[PDB]
Amino acid sequence: RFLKVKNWETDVVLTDTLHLKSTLETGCTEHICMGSIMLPVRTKDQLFPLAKEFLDQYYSSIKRFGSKAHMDRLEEVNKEIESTSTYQLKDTELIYGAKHAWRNASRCVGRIQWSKLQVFDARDCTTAHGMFNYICNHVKYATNKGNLRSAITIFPQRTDGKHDFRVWNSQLIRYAGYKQPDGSTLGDPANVQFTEICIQQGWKAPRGRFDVLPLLLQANGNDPELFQIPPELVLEVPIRHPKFDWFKDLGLKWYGLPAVSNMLLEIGGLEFSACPFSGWYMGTEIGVRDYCDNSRYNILEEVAKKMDLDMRKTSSLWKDQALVEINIAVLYSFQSDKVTIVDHHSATESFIKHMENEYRCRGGCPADWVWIVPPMSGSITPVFHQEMLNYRLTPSFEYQPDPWNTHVWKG
Amino acid sequence: RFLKVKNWETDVVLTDTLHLKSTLETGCTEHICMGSIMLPTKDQLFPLAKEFLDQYYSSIKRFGSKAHMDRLEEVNKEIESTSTYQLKDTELIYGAKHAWRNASRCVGRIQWSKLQVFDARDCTTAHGMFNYICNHVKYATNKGNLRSAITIFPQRTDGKHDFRVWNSQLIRYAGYKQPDGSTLGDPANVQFTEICIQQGWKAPRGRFDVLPLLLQANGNDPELFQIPPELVLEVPIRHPKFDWFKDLGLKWYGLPAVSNMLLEIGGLEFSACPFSGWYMGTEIGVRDYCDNSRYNILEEVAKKMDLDMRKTSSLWKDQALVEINIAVLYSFQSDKVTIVDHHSATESFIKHMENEYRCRGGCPADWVWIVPPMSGSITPVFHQEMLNYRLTPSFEYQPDPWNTHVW
Numbered sequence: 072r073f074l075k076v077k078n079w080e081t082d083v084v085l086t087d088t089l090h091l092k093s094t095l096e097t098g099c100t101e102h103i104c105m106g107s108i109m110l111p112v113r114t115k116d117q118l119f120p121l122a123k124e125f126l127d128q129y130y131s132s133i134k135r136f137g138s139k140a141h142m143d144r145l146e147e148v149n150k151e152i153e154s155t156s157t158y159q160l161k162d163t164e165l166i167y168g169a170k171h172a173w174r175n176a177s178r179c180v181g182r183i184q185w186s187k188l189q190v191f192d193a194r195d196c197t198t199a200h201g202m203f204n205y206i207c208n209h210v211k212y213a214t215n216k217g218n219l220r221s222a223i224t225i226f227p228q229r230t231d232g233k234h235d236f237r238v239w240n241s242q243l244i245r246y247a248g249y250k251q252p253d254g255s256t257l258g259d260p261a262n263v264q265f266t267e268i269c270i271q272q273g274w275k276a277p278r279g280r281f282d283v284l285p286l287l288l289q290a291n292g293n294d295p296e297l298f299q300i301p302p303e304l305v306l307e308v309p310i311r312h313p314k315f316d317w318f319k320d321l322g323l324k325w326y327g328l329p330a331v332s333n334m335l336l337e338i339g340g341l342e343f344s345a346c347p348f349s350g351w352y353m354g355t356e357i358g359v360r361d362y363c364d365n366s367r368y369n370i371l372e373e374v375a376k377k378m379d380l381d382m383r384k385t386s387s388l389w390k391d392q393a394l395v396e397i398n399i400a401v402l403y404s405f406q407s408d409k410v411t412i413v414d415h416h417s418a419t420e421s422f423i424k425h426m427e428n429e430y431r432c433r434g435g436c437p438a439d440w441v442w443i444v445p446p447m448s449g450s451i452t453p454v455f456h457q458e459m460l461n462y463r464l465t466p467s468f469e470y471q472p473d474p475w476n477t478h479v480w481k482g
Numbered sequence: 483r484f485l486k487v488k489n490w491e492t493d494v495v496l497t498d499t500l501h502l503k504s505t506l507e508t509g510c511t512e513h514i515c516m517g518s519i520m521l522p523t524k525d526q527l528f529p530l531a532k533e534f535l536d537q538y539y540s541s542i543k544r545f546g547s548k549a550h551m552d553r554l555e556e557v558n559k560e561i562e563s564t565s566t567y568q569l570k571d572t573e574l575i576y577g578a579k580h581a582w583r584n585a586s587r588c589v590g591r592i593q594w595s596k597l598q599v600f601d602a603r604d605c606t607t608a609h610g611m612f613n614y615i616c617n618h619v620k621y622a623t624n625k626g627n628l629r630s631a632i633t634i635f636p637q638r639t640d641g642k643h644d645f646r647v648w649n650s651q652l653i654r655y656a657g658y659k660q661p662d663g664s665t666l667g668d669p670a671n672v673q674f675t676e677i678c679i680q681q682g683w684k685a686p687r688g689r690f691d692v693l694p695l696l697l698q699a700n701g702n703d704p705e706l707f708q709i710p711p712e713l714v715l716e717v718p719i720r721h722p723k724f725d726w727f728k729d730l731g732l733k734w735y736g737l738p739a740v741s742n743m744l745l746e747i748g749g750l751e752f753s754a755c756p757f758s759g760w761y762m763g764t765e766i767g768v769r770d771y772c773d774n775s776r777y778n779i780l781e782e783v784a785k786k787m788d789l790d791m792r793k794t795s796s797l798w799k800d801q802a803l804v805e806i807n808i809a810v811l812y813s814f815q816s817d818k819v820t821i822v823d824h825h826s827a828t829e830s831f832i833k834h835m836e837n838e839y840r841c842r843g844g845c846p847a848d849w850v851w852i853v854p855p856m857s858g859s860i861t862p863v864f865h866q867e868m869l870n871y872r873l874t875p876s877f878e879y880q881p882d883p884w885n886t887h888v889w
């Protein structure tokens with residue numbers, strides 16, 4: 072069966088056959104669409120089919136499907152599963168797997184880059200101090216003095232679910248949030264709870280507006296341990312505006328390296344609960360979301376005040392005006408400092424070319440419109456006009472519950 | 483079976499039970515989400531009628547009452563013998579208001595209970611349709627103090643005697659493809675304009691020519707009528723700060739009036755049911771003015787503002803977009819023509835959603851349509867989870883008539 076998607080700006084029609092390989096469920100039914108809902112230990116029984124599906128995909132990709140090497144590997148994994156109840160990936164399979172989880176990530180606008188991913192194999196890691204060392208090396212490699220390189224570091228897979236590796240931070244680099252007695256927040260409101268955990272675990276908080284948080288790292292199901300990323304490894308950009316000289320005195324800065332650390336990587340039924348990955352920012356993530364969400368730095372008012380915009384009516388579009396200026400400043404600042412960043416026009420145009428390519432060579436490209444369309448200037452980007460099909464392919468990145476809710480404290 | 487929706491800005495959680503009354507299909511399966519796709523007999527009619535009359539009698543607190551059972555009986559008898567039935571005026575009004583209430587793509591539904599319903603089921607000719615439409619246009623416009631209205635022409639019978647407004651909206655601008663190779667006017671209407679010309683319209687061949695109505699009564703060939711120019715309230719677009727803005731020569735009409743949809747009430751199908759409200763400013767300033775396949779004016783405006791157009795990362799498109807939208811709002815407000823900005827409309831929709839959750843058990847909503855086409859995340863709807871499902875009475879999209887019609 073075939074499914075068509077149309078682009079309402081170009082009239083280009085694409086045909087999806089790849090959705091036929093989709094396994095997992097979406098949350099939607101014939102009677103309800105859950106397209107805007109944010110969140111809509113395995114047996115041997117469920118594991119060998121998943122391993123087999125994966126190895127079939129891997130061997131096809133290398134043009135060796137049905138070969139002796141393919142058949143031998145199937146047998147070897149079969150025997151390993153029956154005897155040890157899990158299995159180990161070869162390095163070449165782990166690489167393929169992590170690249171494909173990115174390629175398959177329907178919420179990711181940056182996927183034109185998927186085949187260029189540095190995979191660091193950290194499956195020999197055993198302790199949190201070892202996790203710390205792996206993560207520093209990741210940060211230093213990815214940062215590359217501002218010439219950012221995509222990378223992922225993969226710690227040991229899940230076993231009984233009692234010995235999990237986890238990075239408790241949601242990203243490797245983020246700013247502390249501090250809830251004040253008067254109810255106001257100092258720093259980033261998104262990280263208040265995690266900041267309190269750090270403090271409880273013994274972190275000495277500087278208590279400013281941009282304190283880089285410490286890593287809280289759990290190895291082998293043990294209680295997590297605190298480490299401070301060497302400040303010389305944390306590249307930051309002070310935010311200034313090309314025309315407005317008062318913009319610098321707002322005191323804003325942001326870090327260069329967006330590094331997601333709370334997701335679960337599934338490859339061939341194995342679960343990598345600690346697999347921090349990083350790319351580079353699209354400007355709007357910082358300028359629109361981090362700075363202007365009401366629940367984050369929330370700087371719209373202060374900027375618009377300083378721009379002397381008419382603020383007595385929403386219909387002057389003061390918020391919209393201030394928003395564009397803040398986003399100009401982020402992009403200017405990163406570019407001026409030679410730190411990799413992409414604007415939302417370039418990123419979305421690249422995504423559309425990626426998606427058309429994928430339709431031709433792969434038969435589809437699952438995409439989540441709700442997430443791919445940027446949070447400002449939606450319809451002046453070509454993705455707004457593009458119909459997309461959302462479905463779940465493996466290998467995949469999945470959300471997992473924050474570890475403080477599930478962790479069995481050892482003491 | 484009971485579902486939760488969370489607002490990620492406010493942490494407020496709502497529980498949806500209303501979706502269990504949904505019947506029609508979404509196009510989504512457990513394996514594929516089609517959320518971003520624009521278009522995803524006697525026996526069949528009685529359950530549809532029953533479903534509707536039940537909700538109606540419930541709404542007036544008379545469910546299971548003598549008057550309820552009596553109407554159910556009368557409608558059954560009328561279907562059995564005539565193969566259809568006629569709605570009482572009260573039912574027609576209730577059904578139209580509820581088709582709006584159920585419109586998952588409509589951000590303006592806080593307004594749903596204030597809809598003036600014009601019953602045009604006695605209409606028999608295209609000239610009669612023109613009369614009803616001019617009256618609708620004048621009533622809804624109200625000298626710029628706009629009032630929501632729908633005008634409901636006779637229901638489908640054997641489907642070869644359909645009433646249709648061929649126009650996609652009552653008021654739109656013509657588009658003409660040029661020897662230059664480009665498009666003069668609104669590129670969205672090039673096909674309809676040619677059909678108007680080929681049926682006899684004398685086009686002024688300008689950038690902002692109000693299209694004629696093409697009206698089809700009783701399945702006949704459609705006929706042309708010009709809406710009295712004095713009933714079409716238009717707004718010249720100027721800017722509060724930029725004096726050069728007026729020289730682009732832009733204008734738009736005050737009355738958004740959708741006229742190509744099908745109203746389904748209790749299984750009956752109203753194929754001509756033009757309706758109208760008032761604009762959210764982004765529809766004109768973002769979509770009508772700045773879509774690449776529409777008036778596509780970003781480049782001209784950016785140039786007049788002398789922005790750096792060498793690189794996308796200067797955000798020249800984004801700056802010009804805001805200014806265009808400030809101008810649309812300023813112009814309508816100055817000329818005292820009802821308009822709503824996207825901040826105000828989305829704030830009201832969150833309030834409406836909360837009312838609908840507490841009072842009705844939910845509110846079907848299509849996030850892809852509800853979130854405005856600019857500044858998405860600085861409006862509260864961006865952070866609001868929405869469940870999309872189909873309730874009846876409903877408005878449904880129907881295919882352009884020129885494909886269906888035989889002359």
Ligand code: HEM
Binds near residue numbers: 169179221223352
């Ligand atoms: C290289 C440049 C990249 C850019 C510009 C980019 C852009 C983005 C953006 C804007 C989002 C939505 C983020 C949000 O709103 O929170 C996203 C999501 C995501 N991307 Fe990328 N991305 C890049 C690289 C990567 C890499 C290297 C990976 C993995 C190897 C990846 C996997 C993901 C996943 C799994 C999501 C969904 C995140 C979630 O559910 O929280 N991306 N991407």
Ligand code: HEM
Binds near residue numbers: 591630632877
């Ligand atoms: C009172 C002021 C109103 C406002 C501000 C408003 C707002 C909007 C907006 C912005 C859209 C999206 C339009 C588009 O992007 O093409 C829309 C869609 C829609 N609205 Fe409203 N609306 C109003 C009144 C009405 C009325 C009176 C009705 C019916 C009686 C209605 C029913 C619909 C329907 C069925 C759609 C989807 C149209 C389609 O699929 O093309 N609305 N509304």
Ligand SMILES: Cc1cc(N)nc(C[C@@H]2CNC[C@@H]2OCCN[C@H]2C[C@@H]2c2cccc(F)c2)c1
Binds near residue numbers: 242330350
């Ligand atoms: C409930 C929930 C579910 C889910 N799947 N993700 C989240 C995280 C939510 C989703 N938007 C806000 C918060 O993420 C902030 C982190 N953004 C980093 C991903 C972007 C990024 C950008 C560029 C390269 C990358 F590798 C990564 C929350």
Ligand SMILES: Cc1cc(N)nc(C[C@@H]2CNC[C@@H]2OCCN[C@H]2C[C@@H]2c2cccc(F)c2)c1
Binds near residue numbers: 521651757760761
């Ligand atoms: C393929 C297709 C399907 C569909 N359901 N609608 C369309 C119409 C497409 C969808 N967005 C653009 C085009 O409508 C422009 C009409 N805008 C008027 C509706 C808005 C409006 C606004 C305020 C009050 C109202 F009563 C009505 C096209």
Ligand SMILES: C[C@H](O)[C@H](O)[C@H]1CNc2nc(N)[nH]c(=O)c2N1
Binds near residue numbers: 107108443
């Ligand atoms: C409720 C809604 O799904 C939610 O706010 C989404 C909308 N789109 C998004 N898109 C991106 N890229 N990131 C997000 O966090 C969100 N949040």
Ligand SMILES: C[C@H](O)[C@H](O)[C@H]1CNc2nc(N)[nH]c(=O)c2N1
Binds near residue numbers: 079456459517520852
């Ligand atoms: C493909 C995508 O569904 C399409 O471009 C949609 C997106 N959201 C929209 N939202 C509104 N209000 N109106 C539209 O016409 C559209 N177009």
Ligand SMILES: [Zn+2]
Binds near residue numbers: 515516
């Ligand atoms: Zn869906």
